[PDB]
Every structure is written in C-alpha cells, then in structure tokens.
Write an enzyme that holds these catalytic residues in place. Structure first.
Site, mmCIF file in Angstrom:
data_model
loop_
_atom_site.group_PDB
_atom_site.id
_atom_site.type_symbol
_atom_site.label_atom_id
_atom_site.label_comp_id
_atom_site.label_asym_id
_atom_site.label_seq_id
_atom_site.Cartn_x
_atom_site.Cartn_y
_atom_site.Cartn_z
ATOM 1 N N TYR A 37 2.951 10.023 0.596
ATOM 2 C CA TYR A 37 3.879 9.445 1.548
ATOM 3 C C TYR A 37 5.319 9.820 1.226
ATOM 4 O O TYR A 37 6.200 9.587 2.053
ATOM 5 C CB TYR A 37 3.744 7.930 1.630
ATOM 6 C CG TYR A 37 2.385 7.424 2.076
ATOM 7 C CD1 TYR A 37 1.433 8.271 2.631
ATOM 8 C CD2 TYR A 37 2.026 6.103 1.869
ATOM 9 C CE1 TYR A 37 0.173 7.797 2.988
ATOM 10 C CE2 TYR A 37 0.779 5.619 2.228
ATOM 11 C CZ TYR A 37 -0.156 6.468 2.769
ATOM 12 O OH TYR A 37 -1.410 5.968 3.086
ATOM 13 N N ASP A 77 0.837 -1.195 0.000
ATOM 14 C CA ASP A 77 0.000 0.000 0.000
ATOM 15 C C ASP A 77 0.874 1.247 0.000
ATOM 16 O O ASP A 77 1.616 1.489 0.959
ATOM 17 C CB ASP A 77 -0.948 0.010 1.191
ATOM 18 C CG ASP A 77 -1.845 1.198 1.140
ATOM 19 O OD1 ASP A 77 -2.810 1.159 0.333
ATOM 20 O OD2 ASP A 77 -1.585 2.187 1.868
HETATM 21 N N1 LIG Z 1 -6.026 5.715 3.302
HETATM 22 C C1 LIG Z 1 -5.585 6.501 4.323
HETATM 23 O O1 LIG Z 1 -6.020 7.655 4.471
HETATM 24 C C2 LIG Z 1 -4.634 5.879 5.270
HETATM 25 C C3 LIG Z 1 -4.457 6.413 6.545
HETATM 26 C C4 LIG Z 1 -3.584 5.783 7.425
HETATM 27 C C5 LIG Z 1 -2.898 4.629 7.034
HETATM 28 N N2 LIG Z 1 -3.066 4.166 5.750
HETATM 29 C C6 LIG Z 1 -2.287 2.970 5.273
HETATM 30 O O2 LIG Z 1 -2.356 1.971 6.305
HETATM 31 C C7 LIG Z 1 -1.015 1.606 6.713
HETATM 32 C C8 LIG Z 1 -1.045 1.135 8.151
HETATM 33 O O3 LIG Z 1 -1.524 2.159 9.048
HETATM 34 P P1 LIG Z 1 -0.494 3.074 9.908
HETATM 35 O O4 LIG Z 1 0.801 3.158 9.174
HETATM 36 O O5 LIG Z 1 -1.255 4.335 10.207
HETATM 37 O O6 LIG Z 1 -0.313 2.318 11.292
HETATM 38 P P2 LIG Z 1 -0.292 0.811 11.826
HETATM 39 O O7 LIG Z 1 0.034 -0.142 10.715
HETATM 40 O O8 LIG Z 1 -1.528 0.614 12.654
HETATM 41 O O9 LIG Z 1 0.936 0.923 12.882
HETATM 42 C C9 LIG Z 1 2.231 1.236 12.388
HETATM 43 C C10 LIG Z 1 3.130 1.350 13.611
HETATM 44 O O10 LIG Z 1 3.167 0.064 14.325
HETATM 45 C C11 LIG Z 1 4.546 -0.264 14.586
HETATM 46 N N3 LIG Z 1 4.577 -1.722 14.510
HETATM 47 C C12 LIG Z 1 4.390 -2.482 13.373
HETATM 48 N N4 LIG Z 1 4.460 -3.762 13.672
HETATM 49 C C13 LIG Z 1 4.658 -3.836 15.029
HETATM 50 C C14 LIG Z 1 4.848 -4.917 15.881
HETATM 51 N N5 LIG Z 1 4.828 -6.239 15.464
HETATM 52 N N6 LIG Z 1 5.065 -4.647 17.185
HETATM 53 C C15 LIG Z 1 5.090 -3.379 17.592
HETATM 54 N N7 LIG Z 1 4.944 -2.282 16.847
HETATM 55 C C16 LIG Z 1 4.763 -2.573 15.559
HETATM 56 C C17 LIG Z 1 5.333 0.417 13.479
HETATM 57 O O11 LIG Z 1 6.684 0.577 13.921
HETATM 58 P P3 LIG Z 1 7.952 0.424 12.893
HETATM 59 O O12 LIG Z 1 7.519 0.753 11.499
HETATM 60 O O13 LIG Z 1 8.964 1.369 13.526
HETATM 61 O O14 LIG Z 1 8.408 -1.015 13.066
HETATM 62 C C18 LIG Z 1 4.576 1.734 13.297
HETATM 63 O O15 LIG Z 1 5.024 2.686 14.274
HETATM 64 C C19 LIG Z 1 -0.262 2.900 6.465
HETATM 65 O O16 LIG Z 1 1.145 2.710 6.485
HETATM 66 C C20 LIG Z 1 -0.782 3.257 5.096
HETATM 67 O O17 LIG Z 1 -0.201 2.383 4.114
HETATM 68 C C21 LIG Z 1 -3.908 4.773 4.861
#
Ligand SMILES: NC(=O)c1ccc[n+]([C@@H]2O[C@H](COP(=O)([O-])OP(=O)(O)OC[C@H]3O[C@@H](n4cnc5c(N)ncnc54)[C@H](OP(=O)(O)O)[C@@H]3O)[C@@H](O)[C@H]2O)c1
Length: 316
Positions: free
Chosen positions: A49, A44
C-alpha cells in the site's frame, strides 16, 4: 455484538478495523489518528500500500499522547507477492515493522498465494500482460511465516485470497507449527462467500471481509460495474434503520461472525463507519443482502490468471 473475536493464539481481534489500501500518504496519518480517537483499534495495512510509514506516524503520535497503549492496538500487515522466497520473508516483515515503527505485528498475512518474481517492481509483468511468477510454493512460504511467530516478530499468522484447497494445503502440511488464524477475503453482498466462509469457520479460521463497501475507489473500476454503496435496495434497508448504506454494509459481515475492514480517509466517514454497534439487521435484512450474491469480484487479480497458484479458478 462482542467487539472482538478469539483467534487460535488466544488473542482477541477487533471485529471492526480501518482499511488503508489507497489511503494516500498525504492523508492516511490523519485518517488513522481520527480512527484511533473514535475507537478503532484494528488497522489493516500492507507493504504494497506504500503508506506504512505514515500509518506508523499516526500510531506513534497516539501512543505518545497516551490515547492508547500498544497492547490495545491490533495491527495487521501482509507479505507482498515479491517476497515469497523463504529467505526474503523476514526482511519483508522487518521492513514493515520499521515503517510502522513497531516491534511486533498482531497478525501477518500472506497477501496472495501467488509468488511474483523478486525485485523492486511490485507487479512485474511480461509482454503478454501476465505477471512474472516466482518459484515459490505455499508450504515453504508458510514455514517462513511460522518462523516469524517463533521469533516474536508477529503474534499470529494468516493468509489472504486463499481458496479452500490452498487453505487445506497448509492445514495438511507435515510438521505444521501454526495453523492460519485468519483468511482475509473479499466479501460483500455481491460476493457473499458462503462456501469459503463455511469452510474456514468449520476449520477454526476467522474470516476477515475486505472491500465490504465494494471498493468504489478501486483503480480498474468501469462505469458499468455494480456499485454497492449506490444500490437502491441497500439504501432502502439503511433508511429503515435510519443508518447509512455504508453502516448497513459494515454491520452485515459483523452479523456473520466476520471481521470487517472498511477503508476511509475522510474523518466524518471514519467516525460514521464505526457507529455500527447500536443497531441490528433483521433476519429479513440479512437474507435479502445474502440474496444479492452475483459472484462479482472487485479484486480478481486479472494479470495473474495464468499463475499456478491463482486462487479464483476453483469454485471456492
Ligand atoms: N487482502 C487483500 O488482497 C485486500 C484487497 C482489497 C482490500 N483489502 C483491505 O480491505 C480494505 C477495505 O477495502 P477497500 O479499500 O477495497 O474498499 P471499501 O472499504 O469497500 O471502500 C472504500 C471506499 O469507500 C469510500 N467510503 C468509505 N466510507 C464511506 C461512507 N461512509 N460513505 C461513502 N463512501 C465511503 C471510501 O472513500 P474515502 O476513503 O474517500 O472516504 C473509499 O473510496 C482495504 O483498504 C484494505 O485494507 C485487502
């Protein structure tokens, strides 16, 4: 648990993908390389980004190493809000394709229903702290997305952060050419999205859950905000399965027939987060996780609450 879900264009979308928001350019190439090695096929992405070039580097390397072929990958990106004008949509998609070093996307989403003033700034704000909108509307931006499918730049189109009325607007559009294949929305135990998921699934729209771990790295996090990964009730479910809290949080949406896109740049977590096809959450686990809903959004677009197309005034 089947690993892919059928879209309305006949393509199959991997239910577990790698998120890339806030994956810095200096780390995302390694992140995507490891992800591909350990089995991720869905990535994604988004122009906003600011790391699509470096995602592209990783994909190119793995294609050249013969680790994957292009047909096996499912690459998603998103049209940013400053490009909603019909005349800007194709160039925005082509910039993403050029940065990713690809000749098509598997899925291209309208990132938000809100159009912003075109220009170099991704978040143009005024003195009241409110976003400067553009004179664009959902239906005309959708027609411009449809042209991308007709021209072969993208295999499917969808939406993100649309409420059910905004989805309905597209579905009811006179002369609609392609239905949205996907609505990508925030979804996790604190924002379970029962009504919007039921609506989308009943319309044949696949839902992708973003921020499934509660986006602890989000830039506006406050010390008092809920923290899913540290919730002791979820830690307890994980311990019962000898899994991590993240693994439970990723498996949860999978058992709701959602696609889920956890983000990490840490190689060990990337690998761990994919190991969610060897256990099942129980009925009690699922019910308990659903009961944690508080309608708490990490992505509430608070500078956009006065935009005519702000999605979150409606109940769902
Ligand atoms: N469409 C939209 O408007 C929208 C909005 C938000 C997100 N998104 C998409 O959804 C994806 C996921 O959401 P998000 O990035 O907001 O947050 P998320 O996936 O809920 O959480 C990401 C965070 O969790 C940490 N993490 C990952 N795996 C872990 C584990 N096994 N143990 C502990 N911590 C862990 C990561 O740390 P590290 O990376 O430092 O390991 C990062 O700080 C985004 O990257 C993006 O691609 C889209």
């Amino acid at each position: 648990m089947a690993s892919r879900i059928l879209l309305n264009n006949g393509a199959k979308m991997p239910i577990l993908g790698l998120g890339t928001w806030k994956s810095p350019p200096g780390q995302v190439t390694e992140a995507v390389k490891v992800a591909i090695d350990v089995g991720y096929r869905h990535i994604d992405c988004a122009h906003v980004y600011q790391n699509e070039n470096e995602v592209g580097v990783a994909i190119q390397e793995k294609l050249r190493e013969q680790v994957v072929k292009r047909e096996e990958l499912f690459i998603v990106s998103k049209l940013w809000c400053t490009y909603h004008e019909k005349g800007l949509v194709k160039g925005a998609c082509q910039k993403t394709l050029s940065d990713l070093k690809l000749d098509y996307l598997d899925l291209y989403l309208i990132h938000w229903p809100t159009g912003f003033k075109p220009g170099k700034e991704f978040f143009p704000l005024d003195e009241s702290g409110n976003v400067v909108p553009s004179d664009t509307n959902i239906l005309d931006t959708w027609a411009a997305m449809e042209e991308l499918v007709d021209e072969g730049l993208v295999k499917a189109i969808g939406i993100s952060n649309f409420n059910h009325l905004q989805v309905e607007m597209i579905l009811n559009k006179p002369g609609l050419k392609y239905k949205p294949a996907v609505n990508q929305i925030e979804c996790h135990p604190y924002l379970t999205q029962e009504k919007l998921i039921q609506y989308c699934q009943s319309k044949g729209i696949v839902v992708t859950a973003y921020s499934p771990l509660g986006s602890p790295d989000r830039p506006w996090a406050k010390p008092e905000d809920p923290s899913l990964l540290e919730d002791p009730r979820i830690k307890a479910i994980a311990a019962k399965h000898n899994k991590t809290t993240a693994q439970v949080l990723i498996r949860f949406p999978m058992q709701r027939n959602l696609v889920v896109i956890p983000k990490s740049v840490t190689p060990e977590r990337i690998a761990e987060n994919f190991k969610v096809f060897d256990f099942e959450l129980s009925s009690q686990d699922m019910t308990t996780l659903l009961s944690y809903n508080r309608n708490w959004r990490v992505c509430a677009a608070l500078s956009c609450t006065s935009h005519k197309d702000y999605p979150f005034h409606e109940e769902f």
